[PDB]
Symmetry: C3
Subunit: 160 residues, 3 copies
């Protein structure tokens, strides 16, 4: 693991705040608590995000994965990984890491990005019957996206 | 079809913002409150927002439906100066920031672009204090929540 | 003369921010609160902000009038490292973000630029927990709302 001082700075700034950040053994990997945006079927949901910062950060974007289950066209259902193409449309070397959590993810949950879906089934349901899809979402969220399920989705070695 | 226009419209609607739809994603009305600490602070306006076919490479157009006095806003039509919008707009710009950042900042103090309301520009530079009083009065009569709601075309106004 | 500087000064003043004017748009004082979740969180400072004649092509200068301990700030003069400001500043940068984003983020963790305060850099590296305790105590004595107010030059102090 190499001495990237931009990665170190941004990790420390994220931790030195009111955000709920659970560390690994390195600044390259950590877990961040995330709340679904108000006014969406995700609004009552809590998720744990697996965030990784690459060795050439911030020239390469962070990777983001939902640890507990989420249903979203741009998110792989099994792994939780957020589509790399969608992240790269927003990310630049000047982009503020905080805005991933404050702007990018909430906006993404408000309506998907038109990028080729990682969850094809969610894309199909959204376009066929949005009202029914939203009801399906709310139910899924109430069961999978509790604060408790988010907490237990942190790997045991780093779970409080 | 313009998938980016669709996306940004839907994200605006799927929020706590007060957005009143037309029959298409290309046109809609948004409630807007004047920024605190300005003569506009007690005002409510309805914004006529249009998203062009080549959005977001071409910027949205923005119009105040109920009356506002501002150097960069055409008094009769309510249209916000296109040159002023283009100084801020880029294909990467977030549509929400038009309402959250661009418009509030604009109302805090005008952009030095050739004014659409030349009277407002001259009053502002001759006597700022008197102009601010003139604004507060105009705002208290024309920028009520009621006047904002009524300025939505009848076909799309909540009944 | 400089219409952009005039515009950005007026927008800063026409808000809920606490801005204390000088005799010109080129120089003024802004109240600043330390960011929550840091050893600076209970702090209030007065910032000496100067907008140059070639603004916004040249960045503003920022000085902490009442004392702060931070690797990227010279305590004696108060001045925020010019190199750090220039990493963020561009002619399209919004002045409000200096106060809302740039300074709060800087206080959460220093920029790796050669420190103006070498003492603070050494303390942070050697023992972060002890340094954060040192910070909290310093802040409680030097960064009160009263000390921030008194640090404005008497000619422009309310
Ligand atoms: Cl660590
Ligand atoms: Cl997106
Ligand atoms: Cl529609
Ligand atoms: Cl502007
Ligand atoms: Cl002045
Ligand atoms: Cl910085």
């Amino acid at each position: 693991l190499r001495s990237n001082r931009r990665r170190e700075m941004d990790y420390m700034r994220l931790c030195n705040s009111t955000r709920k950040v659970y560390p690994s053994d390195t600044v390259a990997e950590f877990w961040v608590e995330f709340k679904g945006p108000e006014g969406t079927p995700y609004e009552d949901g809590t998720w744990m995000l697996h965030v990784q910062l690459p060795s050439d950060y911030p020239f390469k974007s962070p990777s983001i994965g939902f640890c507990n289950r989420i249903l979203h066209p741009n998110v792989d259902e099994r792994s939780g990984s957020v589509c790399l193409d969608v992240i790269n449309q927003t990310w630049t070397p000047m982009y503020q890491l905080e805005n991933i959590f404050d702007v990018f993810l909430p906006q993404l949950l408000r309506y998907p990005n038109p990028s080729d879906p990682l969850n094809v089934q969610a894309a199909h349901l959204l376009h066929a019957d949005r009202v029914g899809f939203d009801a399906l979402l709310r139910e899924h969220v109430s069961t999978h996206a509790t604060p408790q399920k988010a907490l237990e989705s942190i790997p045991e070695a780093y779970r409080p």
